[PDB]
Amino acid sequence: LKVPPHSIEAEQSVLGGLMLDNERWDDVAERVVADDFYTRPHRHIFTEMARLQESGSPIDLITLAESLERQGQLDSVGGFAYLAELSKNTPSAANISAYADIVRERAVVREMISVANEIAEAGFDPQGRTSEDLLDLAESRVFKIAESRANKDEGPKNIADVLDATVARIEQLFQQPHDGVTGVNTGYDDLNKKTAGLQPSDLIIVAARPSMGKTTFAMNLVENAAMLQDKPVLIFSLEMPSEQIMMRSLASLSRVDQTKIRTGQLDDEDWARISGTMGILLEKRNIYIDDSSGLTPTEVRSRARRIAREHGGIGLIMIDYLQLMRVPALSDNRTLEIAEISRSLKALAKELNVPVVALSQLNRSLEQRADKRPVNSDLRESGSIEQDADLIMFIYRDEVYHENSDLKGIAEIIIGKQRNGPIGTVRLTFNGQWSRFDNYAGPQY
Amino acid sequence: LKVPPHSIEAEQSVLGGLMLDNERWDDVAERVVADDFYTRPHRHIFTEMARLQESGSPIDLITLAESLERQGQLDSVGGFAYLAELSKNTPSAANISAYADIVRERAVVREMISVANEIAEAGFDPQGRTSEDLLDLAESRVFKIAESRANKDEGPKNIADVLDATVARIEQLFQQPHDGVTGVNTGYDDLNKKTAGLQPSDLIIVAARPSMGKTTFAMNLVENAAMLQDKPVLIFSLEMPSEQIMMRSLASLSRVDQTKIRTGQLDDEDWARISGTMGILLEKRNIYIDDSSGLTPTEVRSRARRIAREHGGIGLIMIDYLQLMRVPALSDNRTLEIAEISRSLKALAKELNVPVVALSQLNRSLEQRADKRPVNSDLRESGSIEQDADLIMFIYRDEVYHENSDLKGIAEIIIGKQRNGPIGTVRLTFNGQWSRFDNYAGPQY
Amino acid sequence: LKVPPHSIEAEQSVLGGLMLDNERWDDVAERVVADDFYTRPHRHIFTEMARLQESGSPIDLITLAESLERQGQLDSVGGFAYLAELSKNTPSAANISAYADIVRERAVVREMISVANEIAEAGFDPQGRTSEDLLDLAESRVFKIAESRANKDEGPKNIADVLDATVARIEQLFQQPHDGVTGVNTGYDDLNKKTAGLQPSDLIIVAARPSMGKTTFAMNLVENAAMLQDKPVLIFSLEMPSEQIMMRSLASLSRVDQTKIRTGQLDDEDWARISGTMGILLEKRNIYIDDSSGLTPTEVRSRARRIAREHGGIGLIMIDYLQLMRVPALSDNRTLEIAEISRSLKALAKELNVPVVALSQLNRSLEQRADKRPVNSDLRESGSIEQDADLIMFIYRDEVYHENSDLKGIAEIIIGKQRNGPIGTVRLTFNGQWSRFDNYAGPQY
Amino acid sequence: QLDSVGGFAYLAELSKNTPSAANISAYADIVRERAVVREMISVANEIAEAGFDPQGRTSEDLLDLAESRVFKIAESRANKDEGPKNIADVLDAT
Ligand SMILES: [Mg+2]
Ligand SMILES: [Mg+2]
Ligand SMILES: [Mg+2]
């Protein structure tokens, strides 16, 4: 019931794994230490192995016994006969660092109990000592423990440990001298300038009123990517089903109208363009659609990670009308619901290192404003999706509100926020007959 | 030999000193509490004595035994002659202060070894626990003892004892004739006049809507307070990681835009200015960044107290987008959550004698107002971070909202609260292409 | 363990205390009775001493023995030697009325045992009795016992006693013909009219948004009633420490801006006024300041009772921003927490008969009104503070909101509640650089 | 639950006996009256024990406890004139 908590079987398993593989010792040398172990024979074995890996790389069965022999230690450290059992056991695979980490943790635990014993000792043993000379000692010891637990990554880093990563990214980008696109491209040249391409660890938002084009624009982004991104994409159509999506997308990629598709009065050239774009999409095999209705961020994360390990690793994610996302815990408070959603999506993007398009709606506030250009406040709910987002870009198409516009066939992509870049107003030509946005070779902005 | 020390003769001496004098109890009960004592009869007797000193001051010999009797407590706390014997004993003199001192001193030690036992045996019994979730428990309990004990200089001080420290501070300030900056220099001479620098035991707030400069500004402050000081600073980036922060700060220092960094398009005169600021930031080693996501106040405290005593003592703390900070006990009431956060940061600043920059957001209330110049009310939650603070200074770039304005490349710092100085409206200039606020040698304001 | 309850050390203690004290007899006579005792010899002694105190005034050792002889009763009540044991021991101090009261109620307890025995006797022995002649009988028994109730200091308080007290107070006021300020003075001659000074037992509340001047106003009240009254004032600065408060107060009294103080950049005419105000503050020794953070009301009580004991008796208390004050029992329900707080403060003021200033805050319910002139409903929590109070008086200086206002340097003190007096709108003048409110000679308000 | 309450043979001994017809309510009256006496013994014993060892308070609340039990059981019992009455009687009071 009561004992020093220690695991000693996985310990020997690590020992034999190091024996049968003289390559991966540095990675466990990061974690495991000679005094980390519990019993002294294992400690002798590991520290001898370490002294040898300084000098003698080959250490499996006999170099160990020889180095142990030259200084006269056989049968005082167990035995070569006993060592046979260690090399015999654990022919296991690269599942070694797990054992290493967990036993390293057990060592930390054992040390904690040791120091609690020391504190109890110094407590019941006064030695003519005061609370002020005692609690301060206790604080200093526990401080030395928690401060130094062989942990480097999670803690606040000195600047030289940050500039290494910064210069590393700069070398990753200079070592490939290429265009002014530091991530995913869209297919649109007027927008890649104000974005440097959809960057790879952000939460993009694509918001606009309902009849405006945001699902259309998003599908255009993803299909263009998947035509120039040899790497998967995802599409979560929580609103409409896959069979509307793909129809819209064939119309987009082939510049034929949607009625002609669904109803079936299309001409030989139309049939040909369809044939070609199909036979393209079926080769690259990027697009993966999920027409699930009421998802949660957990389901999103799982269904994205499933791809991201087996189909390689992914290039972007699209999410239609995230206000349908749910989390039943926060089912009463809608505001905190959306905040949890958005935080989880940003976390996902930082996890998988991809962008996360996340379509959203706007509120019926701009209608009584007479300009109609959507400002960042005009987001459907919670105000936090303008806070966790590293990019927002609204859509406004003046022909909807003004029949007397000189701005018809024209949609402008109001960048309404961008942390790592400028704001602006891109413009593009709308042709919803085949559900596409296209570039605008015309006046500047 | 190994026994819990409980100096018990002094206990009876205290009890009898109180029996023979109703007067000196509040003085004693500065230090004496029910849990302090070793044996339950003493506990019941003393809590009833205290209950009477609350209600009925006269208690010597039999008023206590009688309150005990008023509803049937006799012989569970010893006896009646047992009670009388304590009064008959100890006619000792006025050394009640020292007796109560030691009697108070020993019980906290007893609790200390109790906690040591609890931590150790809890280590033996993990109950679905990791070392990371265990050293946290240790830190939490030990310091919850220490803070609950350490504040034992408390009392209402006579005015002479106040003015001594007041005038000693004033002398230490006149001891060093210098400029009108009694604190950390911000680098912006237009701001230090209304502020006299980021004073050293206060919470500072920088708050603005999501694309306005608050992260940029609060990085300018530390960027300059690292150069001007020889003292460490800390940066808790709860929103986005270090590999973007530093790529924005290199530009903020060296005046080379962020695109020409990440892309690698930067010319020789720009490479040189990268190199200079590199060589500076490495030959000082002041800044310490933590890119952790959902920190609690306690983790902030620990990770600050670490850098405190290793590296001299800190000189500035920045906490990005406060509202992310968690405290899961108060996961439901977000309001009280923020109140706890703010109180904790304030107390931290009071502890380490440094400033604490604590950014925040603003609610979507100023938008439906037609002025857009934020006020002290539009803090994101709880409206306590307008109370626990000492310097609230918003940001307002008019050109973000009004397309057509003469306030372009101008950004003002709408001071909205001070407790020890004047409010105002400072005027600076923004150049986000290299992420910097600059002094505005321009017209009046 | 189980026995008929009766105490006898208190008995002989009281009897001997009366033997050694002819002066103080009536006070014990108001509580103890002949039948109040358990043993009959002491009943004889008590009733005989009482008969003599009616007839024969000196009764210590021999007058009572001689009387008991005149009734021919020696050796029936013990003996004169036994009485010498009574007169020898119990030289106890003035804690005698305590013994009287407790033994009084012990007679009541023994009566309770006897009466329950009577009820159980009627129970075992029904005597052929009806339930309607049983319950109401045995219940009117306890009722008839309740009829005794010699605690005649409660609800049945006829009007004449009230008017006696009231006329006594009116004689306290008219026997001293003075100005129309029956209370603490403030210094603000425009405020004492609407207030008649700060009444000694009422709970005053000062309330305004975070930078409207309430700490300042309150410090001016205390540091003016420190200069007028030769009576102490406390300050529970839970929010800021003494080393800022006192600086502020030096600036207030000496009218020099605080920036010239701490920076040390002040001139001879300023140093003189500093010398003068300090030489006043130390030649009066009148101010106490407690810089403790999370004070519960019990701590506040104790720390005020101390000064009300040592330094005569106190005349003002100030508690800064009471929403810091805790009571950890009610940490979950904040509303009940604050109600406890306010009730404790009112009780304190009624206990010491001294005015409690208790600074409060306001909710963000003004900002969405366009008036901003606060009302009682704009108090930060619980609504008890607007019920358990006797003088709320807000602070609204208008230039904080309306930049273009013709009231700069004007701070009006909206008396928003007062029981024993009017409401109104006092005006003052805000000069904040030296942290003072001053009077205003101006038009009709 | 057979025989946990005596037994069905005893139950038949109950059914066999007592051929009384005229008076049951009066027997019930005296039984309830004795039960009221019994509960009065219970309450008095509670008072005596909670005078001997009632475990901790000021006896100001003990006097109130006596009065409380008294007037409570007074209100719990006393109303036995209670019953639905006739309009030819209610209208008399009205
Ligand atoms: Mg859609
Ligand atoms: Mg930011
Ligand atoms: Mg204040």
Side-chain angles (χ1 to χ4, degrees):
Chain A
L1 191 281
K2 189 180 282 186
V3 66
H6 65 281
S7 178
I8 190 164
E9 295 176 348
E11 187 174 347
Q12 291 179 1
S13 181
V14 174
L15 273 298
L18 274 301
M19 286 177 186
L20 60 85
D21 187 3
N22 292 317
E23 183 178 1
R24 184 177 292 175
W25 180 66
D26 293 332
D27 184 79
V28 175
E30 293 181 355
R31 295 179 176 177
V32 176
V33 176
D35 296 328
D36 190 80
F37 296 96
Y38 182 73
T39 185
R40 288 181 185 88
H42 294 162
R43 295 180 179 173
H44 293 290
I45 294 166
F46 180 81
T47 188
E48 292 291 338
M49 287 169 77
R51 180 263 183 87
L52 292 169
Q53 291 298 102
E54 191 275 331
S55 64
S57 176
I59 54 106
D60 54 3
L61 182 62
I62 190 68
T63 300
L64 188 288
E66 288 179 356
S67 181
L68 193 280
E69 191 275 331
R70 289 180 182 87
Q71 293 81 16
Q73 295 297 319
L74 270 305
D75 297 330
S76 61
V77 298
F80 181 81
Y82 180 80
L83 192 145
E85 186 60 26
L86 283 68
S87 63
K88 186 265 186 183
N89 290 320
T90 179
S92 181
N95 55 7
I96 303 296
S97 179
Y99 297 162
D101 193 356
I102 63 184
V103 174
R104 185 266 192 194
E105 184 173 12
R106 295 289 184 272
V108 173
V109 176
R110 183 176 67 251
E111 185 177 358
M112 182 187 74
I113 288 88
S114 297
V115 178
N117 186 2
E118 292 292 324
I119 293 166
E121 182 173 0
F124 290 166
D125 188 0
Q127 188 57 261
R129 185 174 294 165
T130 62
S131 293
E132 290 175 2
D133 294 331
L134 182 63
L135 278 77
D136 289 335
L137 180 62
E139 287 174 359
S140 179
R141 183 64 61 83
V142 179
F143 181 83
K144 178 173 75 63
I145 292 166
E147 177 181 22
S148 65
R149 191 173 62 184
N151 188 358
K152 278 76 172 172
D153 290 331
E154 297 290 334
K157 292 183 179 181
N158 196 356
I159 194 163
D161 292 331
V162 177
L163 296 164
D164 188 3
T166 297
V167 177
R169 187 174 291 173
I170 294 170
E171 186 176 357
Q172 191 281 130
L173 296 171
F174 179 81
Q175 189 270 329
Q176 61 99 31
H178 292 85
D179 58 348
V181 179
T182 63
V184 174
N185 189 3
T186 65
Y188 296 102
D189 190 7
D190 294 328
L191 182 66
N192 289 326
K193 289 175 91 292
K194 293 186 179 63
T195 307
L198 300 171
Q199 294 295 115
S201 64
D202 54 4
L203 177 69
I204 296 98
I205 291 173
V206 180
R209 294 298 299 284
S211 299
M212 186 60 70
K214 59 182 187 284
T215 304
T216 306
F217 184 57
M219 289 301 303
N220 288 310
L221 293 177
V222 307
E223 71 192 8
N224 284 317
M227 288 189 295
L228 55 86
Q229 180 72 31
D230 290 328
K231 189 183 285 292
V233 304
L234 279 87
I235 296 178
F236 295 168
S237 180
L238 281 73
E239 188 178 357
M240 65 181 78
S242 304
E243 295 86 3
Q244 293 185 6
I245 296 298
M246 186 58 73
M247 194 179 289
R248 278 212 213 198
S249 181
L250 295 176
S252 173
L253 294 175
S254 59
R255 289 187 182 267
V256 300
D257 296 328
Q258 187 174 11
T259 59
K260 293 172 65 177
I261 297 295
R262 65 175 64 255
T263 309
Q265 288 82 13
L266 70 165
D267 296 332
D268 292 331
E269 187 177 359
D270 300 332
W271 293 106
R273 290 181 289 178
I274 298 292
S275 295
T277 185
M278 286 184 180
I280 289 167
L281 295 174
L282 277 78
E283 295 292 333
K284 291 185 185 287
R285 189 61 69 86
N286 295 119
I287 300 172
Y288 293 161
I289 298 165
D290 186 358
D291 56 358
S292 182
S293 296
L295 296 175
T296 61
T298 303
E299 295 182 351
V300 167
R301 183 176 180 270
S302 299
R303 294 178 184 186
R305 288 178 72 188
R306 186 176 299 120
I307 291 96
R309 65 174 65 90
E310 71 193 355
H311 296 283
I314 61 172
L316 59 89
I317 297 168
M318 191 285 275
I319 296 169
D320 192 353
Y321 180 62
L322 83 168
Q323 290 86 17
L324 295 171
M325 296 298 285
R326 291 185 292 110
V327 64
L330 287 72
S331 61
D332 193 356
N333 208 152
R334 185 65 179 168
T335 300
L336 297 172
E337 185 173 7
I338 305 301
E340 182 64 27
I341 289 164
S342 191
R343 183 176 66 74
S344 292
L345 298 179
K346 181 68 175 181
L348 179 65
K350 187 185 286 190
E351 181 176 0
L352 298 168
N353 191 357
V354 295
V356 179
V357 180
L359 282 72
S360 179
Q361 297 293 127
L362 286 82
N363 57 1
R364 315 216 292 229
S365 65
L366 67 165
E367 293 296 333
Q368 296 84 13
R369 191 167 69 232
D371 190 3
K372 307 285 190 180
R373 306 281 186 186
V375 298
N376 195 349
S377 300
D378 283 13
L379 276 162
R380 182 46 184 185
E381 290 174 351
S382 303
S384 173
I385 55 177
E386 56 180 15
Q387 296 174 359
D388 293 319
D390 290 339
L391 181 62
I392 294 176
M393 64 188 171
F394 297 104
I395 299 166
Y396 184 76
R397 195 178 67 186
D398 197 1
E399 62 92 29
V400 176
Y401 292 102
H402 295 85
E403 187 59 20
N404 64 358
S405 66
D406 299 318
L407 195 282
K408 69 185 288 183
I410 297 294
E412 66 172 21
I413 305 304
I414 296 159
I415 294 168
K417 169 168 197 294
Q418 186 178 352
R419 255 210 265 291
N420 296 117
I423 65 169
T425 299
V426 184
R427 179 183 294 171
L428 302 170
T429 191
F430 178 69
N431 42 32
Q433 63 275 24
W434 61 71
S435 289
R436 192 175 169 79
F437 287 16
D438 287 327
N439 283 318
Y440 184 71
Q444 63 184 0
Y445 307 95
Chain B
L1 189 283
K2 184 182 287 184
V3 63
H6 62 282
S7 181
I8 188 164
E9 294 179 352
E11 183 173 352
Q12 294 178 354
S13 178
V14 170
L15 274 296
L18 275 297
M19 289 174 187
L20 59 84
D21 187 7
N22 291 313
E23 182 177 1
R24 185 177 288 170
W25 179 66
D26 292 336
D27 183 76
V28 175
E30 291 182 357
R31 298 181 175 173
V32 179
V33 180
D35 295 331
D36 183 74
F37 292 105
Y38 180 80
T39 191
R40 291 182 181 84
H42 289 169
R43 293 178 180 178
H44 295 289
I45 291 167
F46 180 82
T47 189
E48 292 291 333
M49 288 176 77
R51 182 264 183 86
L52 294 172
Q53 296 294 109
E54 189 276 327
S55 66
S57 179
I59 58 102
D60 57 358
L61 176 63
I62 189 70
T63 305
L64 189 284
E66 290 277 325
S67 182
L68 194 282
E69 196 276 344
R70 285 175 75 83
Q71 284 192 10
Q73 296 284 326
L74 276 296
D75 295 327
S76 63
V77 296
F80 181 78
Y82 182 74
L83 191 149
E85 183 61 24
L86 279 72
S87 60
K88 188 266 183 185
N89 292 130
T90 175
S92 175
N95 57 3
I96 304 299
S97 182
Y99 292 167
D101 197 354
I102 59 170
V103 171
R104 186 266 186 201
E105 181 175 2
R106 296 290 185 270
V108 176
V109 177
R110 186 178 63 251
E111 184 175 2
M112 185 180 72
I113 297 92
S114 297
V115 167
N117 189 0
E118 292 296 332
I119 295 166
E121 185 176 0
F124 293 163
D125 187 1
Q127 187 60 261
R129 183 175 294 170
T130 61
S131 292
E132 293 181 356
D133 296 331
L134 180 63
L135 278 78
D136 291 342
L137 182 63
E139 291 177 354
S140 181
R141 184 66 62 82
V142 173
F143 184 79
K144 185 182 289 181
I145 295 165
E147 187 177 16
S148 177
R149 183 265 180 276
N151 197 0
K152 186 58 179 70
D153 58 355
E154 291 185 344
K157 296 182 176 183
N158 191 3
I159 187 162
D161 295 328
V162 176
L163 290 170
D164 184 8
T166 299
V167 173
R169 184 176 295 178
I170 290 169
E171 186 175 4
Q172 189 283 129
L173 295 173
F174 182 76
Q175 180 176 5
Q176 60 98 30
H178 287 80
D179 56 351
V181 176
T182 54
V184 182
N185 190 358
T186 63
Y188 295 107
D189 195 1
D190 292 328
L191 183 66
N192 293 332
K193 289 176 92 292
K194 275 68 73 181
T195 296
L198 298 169
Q199 295 298 117
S201 65
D202 57 0
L203 179 69
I204 296 97
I205 288 169
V206 186
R209 296 298 302 283
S211 287
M212 191 63 70
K214 60 187 183 287
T215 302
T216 304
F217 185 55
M219 290 301 301
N220 302 131
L221 296 180
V222 303
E223 174 188 343
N224 289 321
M227 294 296 175
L228 298 168
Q229 295 179 346
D230 61 350
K231 193 181 282 294
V233 307
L234 273 79
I235 293 167
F236 293 97
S237 175
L238 283 73
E239 189 173 20
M240 59 181 188
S242 306
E243 293 82 7
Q244 296 179 357
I245 297 297
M246 188 56 73
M247 190 180 284
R248 135 179 313 187
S249 180
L250 291 174
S252 172
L253 286 166
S254 61
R255 294 183 180 269
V256 301
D257 56 358
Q258 189 175 10
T259 60
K260 290 175 74 174
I261 291 169
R262 65 178 64 258
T263 312
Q265 297 183 345
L266 70 169
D267 297 327
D268 295 329
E269 183 176 4
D270 294 345
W271 293 104
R273 292 186 281 119
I274 297 293
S275 289
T277 185
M278 187 65 69
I280 292 166
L281 296 172
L282 274 77
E283 296 290 336
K284 288 177 96 289
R285 302 292 183 92
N286 293 121
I287 301 168
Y288 294 94
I289 303 164
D290 186 76
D291 60 352
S292 180
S293 296
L295 297 176
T296 62
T298 305
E299 292 182 357
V300 175
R301 292 183 61 256
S302 301
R303 293 179 179 187
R305 291 180 68 256
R306 183 175 300 121
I307 289 96
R309 63 184 73 189
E310 291 184 352
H311 301 159
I314 54 162
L316 185 58
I317 299 173
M318 192 276 278
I319 296 168
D320 194 353
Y321 184 46
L322 184 152
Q323 287 87 26
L324 295 169
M325 294 172 81
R326 292 185 291 110
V327 60
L330 283 71
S331 64
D332 185 8
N333 210 156
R334 182 67 176 170
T335 300
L336 298 172
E337 189 176 350
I338 303 298
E340 182 65 26
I341 292 165
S342 188
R343 183 177 67 72
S344 296
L345 301 176
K346 181 65 177 181
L348 175 65
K350 188 180 287 180
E351 182 173 10
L352 297 174
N353 189 8
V354 299
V356 176
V357 181
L359 281 78
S360 180
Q361 296 285 341
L362 286 67
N363 62 1
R364 317 211 292 217
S365 172
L366 70 157
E367 296 282 334
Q368 284 75 240
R369 193 173 71 189
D371 189 358
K372 305 285 182 77
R373 293 177 186 269
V375 297
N376 196 17
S377 297
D378 300 358
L379 286 308
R380 181 52 188 191
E381 292 175 349
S382 292
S384 178
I385 57 173
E386 65 186 9
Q387 297 174 4
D388 295 321
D390 294 329
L391 177 61
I392 294 165
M393 61 194 176
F394 296 104
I395 305 173
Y396 181 71
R397 300 174 65 233
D398 193 71
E399 69 94 21
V400 176
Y401 296 157
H402 298 160
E403 169 49 28
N404 68 329
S405 62
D406 310 284
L407 200 277
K408 182 172 176 65
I410 300 295
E412 62 181 12
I413 305 297
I414 299 159
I415 294 170
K417 179 182 170 59
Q418 284 190 16
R419 257 210 283 272
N420 290 319
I423 62 169
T425 299
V426 179
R427 186 177 297 275
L428 302 166
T429 189
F430 181 74
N431 41 27
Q433 66 281 19
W434 61 71
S435 300
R436 179 57 189 278
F437 286 18
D438 288 326
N439 289 325
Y440 185 61
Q444 65 184 356
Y445 59 87
Chain C
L1 190 283
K2 188 185 285 187
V3 61
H6 64 279
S7 181
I8 191 165
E9 291 189 354
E11 184 170 8
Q12 181 169 356
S13 180
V14 173
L15 273 296
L18 275 299
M19 288 177 191
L20 59 88
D21 191 355
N22 284 322
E23 185 177 0
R24 184 177 292 168
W25 177 69
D26 291 331
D27 190 78
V28 174
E30 289 176 359
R31 294 180 175 168
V32 175
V33 178
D35 288 331
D36 199 78
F37 295 93
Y38 182 75
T39 191
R40 292 181 181 85
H42 293 174
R43 290 178 182 178
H44 292 291
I45 296 166
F46 180 81
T47 188
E48 291 291 337
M49 292 174 79
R51 181 264 183 92
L52 294 172
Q53 288 294 100
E54 189 276 340
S55 66
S57 177
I59 54 111
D60 56 358
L61 182 59
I62 191 66
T63 306
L64 189 282
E66 289 172 358
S67 177
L68 194 282
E69 193 274 331
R70 288 179 184 96
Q71 288 90 30
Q73 296 296 323
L74 273 300
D75 293 328
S76 64
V77 296
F80 180 78
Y82 185 76
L83 194 148
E85 183 65 19
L86 276 74
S87 65
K88 186 267 184 184
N89 292 317
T90 177
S92 176
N95 54 13
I96 304 298
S97 185
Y99 298 169
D101 188 359
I102 59 177
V103 177
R104 188 266 182 191
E105 191 164 14
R106 290 292 173 284
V108 177
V109 173
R110 188 176 63 252
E111 181 177 8
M112 185 181 71
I113 286 86
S114 298
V115 174
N117 191 0
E118 292 292 331
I119 296 167
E121 183 175 0
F124 292 163
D125 189 0
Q127 189 56 260
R129 183 177 294 172
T130 63
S131 291
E132 293 177 354
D133 290 328
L134 183 65
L135 278 80
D136 184 79
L137 181 64
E139 296 169 346
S140 180
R141 181 64 61 85
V142 176
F143 182 75
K144 181 177 174 65
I145 296 162
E147 185 175 2
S148 60
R149 186 62 181 177
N151 189 5
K152 295 185 286 186
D153 196 355
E154 286 88 5
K157 183 61 66 69
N158 196 346
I159 192 166
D161 293 323
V162 176
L163 294 173
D164 184 3
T166 304
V167 176
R169 183 175 291 178
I170 291 170
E171 185 177 4
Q172 188 273 332
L173 296 172
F174 182 73
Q175 185 177 0
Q176 57 100 38
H178 290 88
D179 59 349
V181 180
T182 53
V184 175
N185 189 357
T186 68
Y188 294 100
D189 292 325
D190 196 1
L191 183 62
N192 294 326
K193 289 174 94 292
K194 274 66 73 184
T195 304
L198 317 179
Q199 297 312 128
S201 86
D202 68 354
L203 165 68
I204 297 97
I205 291 170
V206 181
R209 297 297 300 278
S211 279
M212 193 57 68
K214 55 184 192 288
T215 303
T216 304
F217 183 69
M219 288 303 303
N220 291 325
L221 297 176
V222 303
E223 76 202 356
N224 211 145
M227 289 189 299
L228 299 174
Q229 287 75 23
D230 287 329
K231 191 183 282 295
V233 305
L234 279 77
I235 290 167
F236 293 105
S237 178
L238 281 71
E239 191 177 2
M240 63 177 82
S242 299
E243 294 84 8
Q244 296 179 358
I245 294 293
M246 186 58 69
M247 188 176 290
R248 180 170 301 218
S249 181
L250 293 175
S252 176
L253 298 174
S254 68
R255 291 182 188 263
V256 300
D257 58 351
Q258 193 178 0
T259 56
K260 291 178 70 179
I261 292 170
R262 75 279 301 273
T263 314
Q265 289 175 357
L266 69 168
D267 293 333
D268 295 333
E269 184 174 357
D270 301 329
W271 293 105
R273 300 181 281 187
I274 302 297
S275 290
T277 187
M278 286 176 190
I280 293 161
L281 290 176
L282 280 78
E283 293 295 331
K284 194 183 279 289
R285 293 178 184 275
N286 204 21
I287 295 170
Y288 294 99
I289 299 168
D290 186 77
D291 300 334
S292 296
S293 296
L295 297 174
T296 59
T298 307
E299 298 180 349
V300 172
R301 283 177 76 256
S302 296
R303 294 181 181 183
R305 297 293 298 280
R306 187 179 294 278
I307 293 97
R309 182 177 299 118
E310 300 177 354
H311 299 281
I314 65 170
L316 184 62
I317 300 164
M318 191 280 275
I319 299 162
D320 198 350
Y321 178 42
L322 76 168
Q323 288 84 18
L324 273 72
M325 297 168 73
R326 292 181 293 113
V327 61
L330 284 67
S331 64
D332 191 0
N333 212 148
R334 186 69 177 165
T335 297
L336 297 174
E337 186 174 2
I338 304 295
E340 183 65 29
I341 291 169
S342 179
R343 186 174 65 75
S344 290
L345 298 177
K346 181 69 175 179
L348 179 60
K350 188 183 287 184
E351 182 176 5
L352 296 169
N353 195 4
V354 302
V356 177
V357 178
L359 280 71
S360 176
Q361 299 288 123
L362 290 84
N363 55 6
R364 334 216 283 214
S365 152
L366 306 173
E367 297 288 335
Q368 297 179 350
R369 292 176 73 191
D371 193 3
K372 285 91 168 66
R373 293 179 187 269
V375 300
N376 293 328
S377 304
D378 277 78
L379 261 341
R380 179 51 185 215
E381 255 132 7
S382 322
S384 310
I385 44 214
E386 60 177 15
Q387 295 169 3
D388 290 327
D390 300 334
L391 183 63
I392 295 168
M393 63 193 175
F394 296 103
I395 303 172
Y396 181 70
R397 52 179 305 266
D398 197 7
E399 62 170 356
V400 179
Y401 291 109
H402 296 88
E403 177 56 24
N404 63 340
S405 63
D406 296 323
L407 295 173
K408 63 189 295 183
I410 305 295
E412 63 174 22
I413 304 302
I414 303 156
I415 298 168
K417 183 176 187 295
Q418 186 179 2
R419 272 214 263 291
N420 298 115
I423 58 169
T425 306
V426 181
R427 292 180 183 176
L428 301 170
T429 190
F430 180 80
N431 37 27
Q433 63 275 29
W434 59 70
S435 298
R436 180 79 187 168
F437 285 20
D438 286 327
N439 295 306
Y440 180 69
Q444 64 182 356
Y445 64 87
Chain D
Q1 296 295 320
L2 274 298
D3 295 328
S4 65
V5 298
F8 181 70
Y10 185 64
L11 192 156
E13 182 64 23
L14 275 72
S15 66
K16 187 266 184 184
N17 292 321
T18 178
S20 178
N23 55 354
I24 306 296
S25 177
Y27 294 165
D29 190 4
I30 60 171
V31 172
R32 187 263 187 189
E33 185 176 1
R34 296 289 184 272
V36 173
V37 175
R38 189 177 62 245
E39 186 171 357
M40 186 184 70
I41 286 92
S42 297
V43 175
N45 189 358
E46 291 294 332
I47 297 165
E49 184 176 3
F52 293 161
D53 191 2
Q55 187 65 245
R57 194 176 288 172
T58 54
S59 292
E60 296 179 352
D61 289 334
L62 184 60
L63 281 71
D64 291 327
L65 182 64
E67 296 173 3
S68 180
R69 183 65 60 84
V70 166
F71 182 72
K72 185 183 286 187
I73 295 171
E75 186 178 359
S76 178
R77 186 266 182 270
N79 194 5
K80 185 55 177 68
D81 295 329
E82 188 170 358
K85 294 180 184 293
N86 195 1
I87 303 306
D89 293 331
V90 171
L91 294 176
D92 186 4
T94 297

